[PDB]
Amino acid sequence: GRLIYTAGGYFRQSLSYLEAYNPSDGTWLRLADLQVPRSGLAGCVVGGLLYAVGGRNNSPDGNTDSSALDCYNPMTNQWSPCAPMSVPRNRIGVGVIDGHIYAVGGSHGCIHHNSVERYEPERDEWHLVAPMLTRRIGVGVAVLNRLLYAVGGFDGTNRLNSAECYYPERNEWRMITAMNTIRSGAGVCVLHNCIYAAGGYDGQDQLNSVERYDVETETWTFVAPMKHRRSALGITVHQGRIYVLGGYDGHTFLDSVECYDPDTDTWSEVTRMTSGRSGVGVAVT
Numbered sequence: 001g002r003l004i005y006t007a008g009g010y011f012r013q014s015l016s017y018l019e020a021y022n023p024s025d026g027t028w029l030r031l032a033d034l035q036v037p038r039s040g041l042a043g044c045v046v047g048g049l050l051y052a053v054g055g056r057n058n059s060p061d062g063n064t065d066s067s068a069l070d071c072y073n074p075m076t077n078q079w080s081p082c083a084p085m086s087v088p089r090n091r092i093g094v095g096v097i098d099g100h101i102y103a104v105g106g107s108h109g110c111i112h113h114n115s116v117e118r119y120e121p122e123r124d125e126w127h128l129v130a131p132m133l134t135r136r137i138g139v140g141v142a143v144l145n146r147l148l149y150a151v152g153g154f155d156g157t158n159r160l161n162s163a164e165c166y167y168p169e170r171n172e173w174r175m176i177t178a179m180n181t182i183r184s185g186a187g188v189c190v191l192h193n194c195i196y197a198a199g200g201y202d203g204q205d206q207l208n209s210v211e212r213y214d215v216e217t218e219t220w221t222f223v224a225p226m227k228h229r230r231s232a233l234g235i236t237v238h239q240g241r242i243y244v245l246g247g248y249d250g251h252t253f254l255d256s257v258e259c260y261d262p263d264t265d266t267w268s269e270v271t272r273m274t275s276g277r278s279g280v281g282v283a284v285t
């Protein structure tokens, strides 16, 4: 009964929606809105709990970068406040290692963070770990073999095709091989032991392309495109299949949800969101 949770986003202003997709029966649930609307946030899950991390309230009465961490219980349909981050991080990436949420990069104003902090749920505290080699907002994050990979983004001056790896136990970052395309606000996730960098923004155009990093060959490889060039897309994995949700395609805020089958090497559209929206965060539980 694991759902695809889609939290926050942007249409006209930052959104509050929390809604869930059942790929099995194709339904959408409407769930308890966020307390404070936010876009450019990230989602993860730890221990059957869903966390919305960072982002931004872009509203009519002004506009404010999030240091927030809020936690949702599906068992209670309730959001609870959580210890805020040391800094606010809009356009943030997040991953999980040992039930520990890594808050990676993001922006405050146009202060572009290279810094990373680890949240620990039991104790409810953030601590700073070793900073990335590169400031990164619009960054995708992928956990793989208990290594944390930060992929692209936008360093403050140029868009990024570069990726780097964190070694949690050594507390160190190391540059891995750069992507075929430059990607800010791509969808980054992991599937069958490869890192997928889906869509994003390359400077000139919004992207439909997708390439997957083989961690042992050290090689990025294109795979089938999406049908809808997109960025600021939500991404996740659900039963051997990648789900890209929504996004910004240059002109509109997409409601489309496309689905990658790695075996057939194809995407198909499987549902629509209830309303078009960019820059959500999504997490499965």
Ligand SMILES: O=C(O)[C@@H]1CCCC[C@H]1C(=O)N1CCc2ccccc2[C@H]1CN1C(=O)c2ccccc2C1=O
Binding pocket: 010, 039, 040, 041, 056, 058, 090, 091, 138, 139, 184, 185, 186, 231, 232, 247, 248, 278, 279
């Ligand atoms: O967070 C912000 O600064 C933006 C405020 C205006 C629209 C929403 C925010 C944004 O720029 N987003 C969504 C969050 C996000 C996350 C990762 C990578 C990129 C983004 C961007 C995508 N994006 C635009 O660049 C943009 C430019 C103009 C209109 C709408 C959008 C839009 O959704």
